[PDB]
Each structure stands twice: as C-alpha cells, then as structure tokens.
C-alpha cells in the first residue's frame, strides 16, 4: 500500500565483530525481522566470516530481499562487540554499508549503537592480558 516515490524505511542492524558480520533488517520498532544474513552464511572457512568480501555478499542478499517486501530505505545502526570487549567495528562494517548503498537502497540516518558501559564488569584474560 505504498505509492510511487514514497520511502518505506526499515532499520538495518549491522553487527560487525572481528569473527563475523550480521546484517539484520527489521521495522522501526525492531520487533519484526525482515531478513537476517550473516557473513558466515556466504563463506566456507571460519577465517573469512568477518572479511569484507563476505559482508558484501551478505548485504547484496539483504538488499534483494528487502525490495521484495517493499522496503527501499534503511536506517543504519552499526555496532561493535561492545560491553567490556572491543569498541572498534570489525572489518566488515564498511563493506556491508557500502554494498547496501550500491543496491538501490536509500540510506537513512546512520548511528553507532555499540553498548558502552558507564564504569563495567571485569574483562577476561587476567590482569596480564592476552599474551601472544
């Protein structure tokens, strides 16, 4: 029930970890999932689930599925792992966002929604940290 020209906005929750990438599209309330493609669904090796190439493929599948449901615009909510873990988005965030823009989807308001503690629980690894 959308006339030509009108934009039907969805919300794309992009979770770009350093081990995998999620491209989860919902409605404005985030309570109705439309499509959810992860980088692990587009590669065979675990080492490539977070790669930008895997994120590009996942974004192309999300864009195609959105057009079927009448969604042509997306709000972007990017996040890293957050909490007491890394706050830096993974290597698939830029690739996923660029791929959506190059598939007919009109990008709306972009926002970073990484969970930031206002203090926090103790981080893993011990006081000497991860020793490599």
Partner RNA sequence: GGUGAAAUUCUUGGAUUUAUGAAAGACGAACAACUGCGAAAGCAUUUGCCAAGGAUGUUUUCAUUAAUCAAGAACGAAAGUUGGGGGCUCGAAGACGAUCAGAUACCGUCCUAGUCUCAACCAUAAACGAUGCCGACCAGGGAUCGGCGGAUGUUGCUAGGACUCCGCCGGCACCUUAUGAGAAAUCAAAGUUUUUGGGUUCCGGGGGGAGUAUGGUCGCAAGGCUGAAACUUAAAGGAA
Query: Interface residues with other proteins (CB under 8 A)?
Result: 1-2, 7-9, 27-29, 31-32, 34, 69, 73, 78, 84, 86-89, 94, 97-98, 100-102, 105-114, 116, 123-132
Contact 84, 127 (CB under 8 A): no
Query: Does residue 126 belong to the site contacting RNA (CB under 7 A)?
Result: yes
DSSP 30-83: S-SEEEEEEGGGS-SSGGGTTSHHHHHHHHHHHHHHHHHTT--EEEEEEE-S-T
Choose the contact partner of 64 out of other proteins, RNA, none; CB within 5 to 8 A by kind: none
* CB nearer other proteins, residue 49 or residue 93: 93
Rounded CA separation 58/62 (Å): 6
* CB nearer RNA, residue 1 or residue 121: 121
Query: Does residue 40 belong to the site contacting RNA (CB under 7 A)?
Result: yes
Rounded CA separation 21/3 (Å): 34
* CB nearer RNA, residue 6 or residue 88: 88
Candidates 111, 117, 46; CA nearest to 21 is 46
Binding site for RNA (CB under 7 A): 13, 15, 17-20, 22, 24, 26, 29-31, 33, 36, 38, 40, 45-47, 49, 77, 79, 81, 84, 113, 116-126, 130-132
């Amino acid at each position: 029930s959308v006339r030509e020209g009108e934009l039907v906005f969805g919300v794309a929750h992009i979770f770009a970890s350093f081990n995998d990438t999620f491209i989860h599209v919902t409605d404005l309330s985030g309570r109705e999932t439309m499509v959810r493609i992860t980088g692990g669904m587009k590669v065979k090796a675990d080492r490539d689930e977070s790669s930008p190439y895997a994120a590009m493929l996942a974004a192309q599948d999300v864009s195609q599925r959105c057009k079927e449901l009448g969604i042509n615009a997306l709000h972007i909510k990017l996040r890293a792992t957050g909490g007491n873990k890394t706050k830096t988005p993974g290597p698939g965030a830029q690739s996923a966002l660029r791929a959506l823009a190059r598939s007919g989807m009109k990008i709306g308001r972009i926002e970073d929604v990484t969970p930031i503690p206002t203090x926090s629980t103790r981080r893993k690894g011990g006081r000497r940290g991860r020793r490599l």
